[model samples]
Target: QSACTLQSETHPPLTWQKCSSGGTCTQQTGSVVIDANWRWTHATNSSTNCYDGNTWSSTLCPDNETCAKNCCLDGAAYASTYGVTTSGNSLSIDFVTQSAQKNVGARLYLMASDTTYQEFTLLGNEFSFDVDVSQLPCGLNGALYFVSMDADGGVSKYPTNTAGAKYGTGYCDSQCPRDLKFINGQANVEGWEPSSNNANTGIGGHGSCCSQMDIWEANSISEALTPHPCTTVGQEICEGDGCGGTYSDNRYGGTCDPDGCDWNPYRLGNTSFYGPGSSFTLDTTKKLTVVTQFETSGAINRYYVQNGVTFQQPNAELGSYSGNELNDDYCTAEEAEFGGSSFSDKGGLTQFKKATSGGMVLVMSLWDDYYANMLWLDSTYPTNETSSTPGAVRGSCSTSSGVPAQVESQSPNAKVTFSNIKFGPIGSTGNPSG
Candidate 1:
């Protein structure tokens, strides 16, 4: 299929908050989608709406019960069974769907008692979320994150990793929602969280979501208050334990052993399998190649495909930088490049990205601090859409001006079949760097 043909302008006509606590509420299984209108959870501090394309003038769900009918899982499916025995201290909810026609997006609300509610916002783009649930205060009566009933409800929890590792594979107890939840006969996380720093930028990669930090920052507000790469000391932390569930005394907050070229070719297994004879290929039929690199075993991480290209900061120097330079209207180039002193890399994937698509891939082989090699790929076609405004592509779950979170996992391998391969990310000398 192409994309989830649903458009933002056509919302479900009826209010979605009327869903019952159980059973399929929507014609599909998710938040209410009557005609083309539905309600969405509005974060307290969020100024922008990925859907309405404007700031919220008022709360969508004036009452918690109403919000329930309007909410939906962030993925194709949302399912979870807490299996309560006695009085449980935690509350967990999941959403799911089978038809690829429906993309998932979810917003969870943590009810303090009976009236007050806290929205637990996870990145909707990926299929795993390592939210530090412990931080969201649920109180003694325990807490419940209200779930939705619609498929394209613009929210969900996908429990899987990039390698497609699903929950309850006899690995994790299915407790860490994202890494193990099963769906439609497949394992997946309700949502996903990349390393603290996305590989799109070449630095501060250590202590990212799964490898280190066990929590998801609340929002821009909460993120600022939290430390970079997140090195918090106590309370239910899980880092690099390799999926046993409970805490491992050894790997806790510890850097990857001998973290260097030793950490390359990142795959499900800490193993690398690229040979001098075996070539890395990209099918640039439609989209342009940006950054492509081979993952070795557990020591390579990622290296630069070339030299001289600068890194873009999303939050600090590069964050406010806009329109692919990563310097947006919010910040200046001078201010964007100011935080050169606080760069950190505790052995994480090193890569780069653009806010708008320009058809270039800076391929890197991570052998050490400096890349072993670099290659660039260029797609020979008319510029259809900027990364800020990507052209029509199948499965683009977005709200405009922002790359949908679900699209992040496929970033490394996005291919479009258009015509011939026009260019590559290397020099005229043909592997001249050697």
Candidate 2:
């Protein structure tokens, strides 16, 4: 813990050689420095909404350059349900509710935008962030990840608005309303349900009852239909309906092909990575540090500091994704989830780089999955302080309306705090490969 001292070889190498004022760590790339203070901010002094890209932007350090020094909490107004506060260079977020029952949920983001925080590309092979979750409650689920979107292409990779038009119509990457979508002519994961149980608005039973990370693609929507390749005769071709009309119309309400859309579309490729607890468990006492690295040559990787309490070097490799195959058309606006011909570059390396070429905003949130135990983190909802059970009051976590009424049923205050946030190139924090 001393200055200028050689840290342990067991911990992940430092992204920067030294720490600056306010616990900021300098990246080896030298493109920029990162720290917890890089919290969300706004362009104007009085704006309070952060959800609107037009008004609020994330702030970066070295504020003297193209960025500003003064920071304010004007963006919180848009996401009124969640609580955000900054002090002594540390950012704290709370997932609270104002309901009599304990069936509520909340999500907050720390995105990069116009003036406050400058947007930077992931030119390097890696990105990292440090977070503390000791205070997180048992019932609540805390999530930390990087999100990128193709705004220019009219593709909503991760739409923030809850209005019916933008929220669940296949915008989620692989979390909620899981459905079939085409990305660059290849079938990819989208239509993830925020609440699996209540996912249906009388549409083709678009939601899955038992949550599992499986790529569902059906030649034809029917029980008599067999698992066959797409375009096969009798095989239901997913077209006409946005990107083949796999999902029921988000604008208008109805069902896909099969009545109630109960039949599985078509099972394509699937991985166990999407289910709850399939990723990583959040330990309240330990610090959770996540590192995402990309290799110009080899496969990309995501590493974590095991147990979250130690600064162990060369953090453990959580998983690795190989380089993509396709060249230019890695993404498309054809479907809500970007469905395509092959997997080559649509899901891994190519898809990631292209989709995020515009730069992704950092988002950290805490919420309760009241609709379905999609994540399967547990059989019971976290804030189960009330009588409502999982899938009990079928619901959707995010809606243009407000934090789900069930989420409002929680106790007084329930929140999650994140600290030691850092980002930079791979090897910026020593060799991530160990």
Candidate 3:
């Protein structure tokens, strides 16, 4: 019943290591490594503790075992296919072809030695990591992200009535209200490309889909809307029909400004920090590192890259000049601008703070975006079998001419490796100065 809580201070002993880039450690060990560039820290505890709200439970477990679902250490629920493994003090996640075959993705939720979901409180303002995407297939995308919810940790609930979709919810009974459920932050990475760069003609979105990073903060839900004029001539208002130009006695559900809902502060999807055409082309021959940080003090989130010597780089190699500032500082000026009509009268600042409460949980996943809509994969591949010009259906059991169909049905051989994982206080680049 209890899950892990956030870590306030460094209670357990911390360890440090130096991770290199490139196919850096593929020789020493079979798994891909995060190398020396990124610093990794883990606090040691004498006893394995389970989750009990914000506090650690005294209930103990033997070595390499989890308290939740009796799962073993690193024995994640989805490890059988995702290839979740801990070797040489590093956590490696491999993406087999199986995910692509079924048109689904794979995910891994971290668990502590005690086996509770590894819920973490931000001791510092950041979380960083280094990964080798050279092995990642072309024309696909992946993400490293986290979510923050209410203390109860309940799933989100959407509005049933269509009118509610225009505004916020009417009433709800659940843990972690929908408004507070937001994607604290995420680093969306792309790899490979499709044959066409034509945006309007293709089945998916833009042509240059696979080579950049888009940082964002999605407001899970927002406050209800204020009364406004009904736009539809014959539409019902306040459960009353407006036969003529005359209005209803009681103001019913009407269209509000700014689309009558909480707008996304960091611009719309795939439009934050960087644009489609400006993304950098990833060199599959080398290693790639992506870092996203959120300042608890300021409620600011930013993205950085580390493909070379410098730890700080733009989301792409081409756009190095544009500084990293995704929703910089809470209650950003951008938020005020976007909330101009919808949130102006509702005290947008106050509402923004309310939706961003509670600690966040880390989520690492890999999957193919065949549709090129959700994850923004290129248009070379088809989401399903039927399409005007469907490309090769990957992740299949058979071995096709160009597609790695065999890899889809098999496991262990085809996967992506992430190394040098670290989460620390602000200004800590997971690198050693001395």
Candidate 4:
């Protein structure tokens, strides 16, 4: 492989807060960068697209090594090209940004600088953020999460990757998604296949795997807090079904917890806990504050604030599981009842604690699931199971509501906004202005 050219990169500015135990907060400067999968990859020193639409150029990228040498990832045009905009301490991404390429959705990371992702060590700490999901619908996911990605996007480890974090190069999660155009400093074009369902996406030869801790995954209709652990601590490029998660043929064949041990208010028998109206308890029609506290004992709890009222998380009524918080035992019950053992197979909360101890990257995204149509979060899941089944009914949406084509065409204007990020010791993160 050869060195690829890097475009002059400039990230969009954003600001957040770090607070002390007594509610004293200090403002911090940061930036935001779009994921590499959404960027343009062109041949070095030219405007010719190395990867146009969903296929790689045959001449410049005949194989992985040549593709890595010839292709380069470009910077984002932000609001104009992808409908990404930021205010004082907030970031938002539009679902359908009109351009030549037809931007559908986006995944972005918090950048401490132009060349590195901002890392947060969350155990025994609290992370809070304000989000507006009123415009989001059933099929969509406006997520703010954490993953064990490299701080520099593996630029120092892999000599071939000149683009690094400046180009939004490294991205991975428990899903081990193979949709990335590049992985581990090499192009994933060896045996790429365009997605049959999504015209703008395709599957690459390799999958990137890592630990993922989800603080929030929601739309107007439903929400979930999940923790996915992995046996491996850092970045790993995997092949075929061995990578597991969504890309693999066998869902249980990977090293990470793909499905996650989730605490969805609806799925846990509190069907009236969250929804669009004030009648459903925590209303989604307006902006709300979300707080997640990670304790030293491997217990993670959720709290919400809206209209100046704080709401406590509801406890699970599943057999033998009683806490509202997520612990190793809750996850064990979730696994036995849900028909998959991947969570404990990946080492449960012990592994999750280790992954968080090292500090992980903060990721925010607005995307629609292509594999399951997001029914797992907002409707009856396992498609074959009846609603009477204990773990089958997840939300109030119809199972047929989230088709990708239906969402991308009917609700192209849907978007999500997040702001007022604050992190500190347990009692310090409620007021953003503190």
If both were scored by lDDT, which would come out higher, candidate 1 or candidate 4?
4
Top candidate (TM-score) = 4
- How many clashing residue pairs are found in candidate 2? 67
- Candidate 3 local lDDT, residue 148: 35
Candidate 2 worst ten-residue window by lDDT? 218-227
Please give, for residues 1-434, the per-residue lDDT of candidate 1 as tens digits: 00121223121111111112232122111111111111222322342221231121134333322322232212112221111111121112211122332222222222222112212221111011111112111000011111111122111232221111111111111111122222222212112223233231111111122122111111100110101121211112133343222122223233221111111111111111211112312111112112211122111111111123322212222344333211112222322332221112332222111100111111000000011000000111123533333111111112221122323232212211111111121121111111
How does model 3 fare in lDDT? 0.28
Give the whole-model CA lDDT for all candidates, comma-separated: 0.18, 0.29, 0.28, 0.86
Our tally of clashes for model 3 stands at 18
Candidate 4 local Cα displacement, residue 106, angstroms:
0.7
Clashes of each: 111, 67, 18, 0
Candidate 4 local lDDT, 1-434, one digit each (tens): 22244544567788999998876898999998888888878888788888887888999999988889888887678888889989889898898889766888788889989889999989889999999999989899999999999989888888888888877888899988888889988998887999888777788879999999988999998899999888887788889778777877777656788888888989989988889987888889999999999999988988899999888898776768787888887888887776677788888889888887888999989999889889998989877788688789888788888888899889999999999999988889864464
Worst 10 residues of 4 by lDDT: 1-10
What lDDT score goes with residue 402 in model 1?
18
On lDDT, the stronger of 2 and 3 is 2
Cα TM-score per model = 0.19, 0.41, 0.40, 0.97
What is the C-alpha lDDT profile of model 2 across 296-317, one tens digit per residue? 5323344556453332122111
